[PDB]
């Protein structure tokens, strides 16, 4: 049940969204947030990420940070 989690990226999909698995066990969807997009933060594949999840579905949520 925990709102900011860390987790892996799996793929990205079409309009700005990835698949990521968190360290809870759960799969969820997100997309980079508007700093990091400001800031050109590029995403991949097995990046490690910190997740803000939606209060209306915690299978979605925004990338916040993405570990160097």
Same mark, same amino acid.
């Given at each position: 049940?925990?709102?900011?989690?860390?987790?892996?990226?799996?793929?990205? #999909? %079409?309009?700005?969204?990835?698949?990521? =698995? /968190?360290?809870?066990?759960?799969?969820?969807?997100?997309? &980079?947030?508007?700093?990091?997009?400001?800031?050109?933060?590029?995403? #991949? %594949?097995?990046?490690?990420?910190?997740? =803000? /999840?939606?209060?209306?579905?915690?299978?979605?949520?925004? &990338?916040?940070?993405?570990?160097?």
């Amino acid at each position: 049940g925990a709102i900011e989690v860390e987790g892996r990226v799996v793929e990205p #999909l %079409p309009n700005a969204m990835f698949r990521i =698995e /968190l360290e809870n066990g759960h799969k969820v969807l997100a997309h &980079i947030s508007g700093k990091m997009r400001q800031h050109y933060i590029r995403i #991949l %594949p097995e990046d490690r990420v910190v997740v =803000e /999840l939606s209060p209306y579905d915690l299978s979605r949520g925004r &990338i916040v940070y993405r570990y160097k």
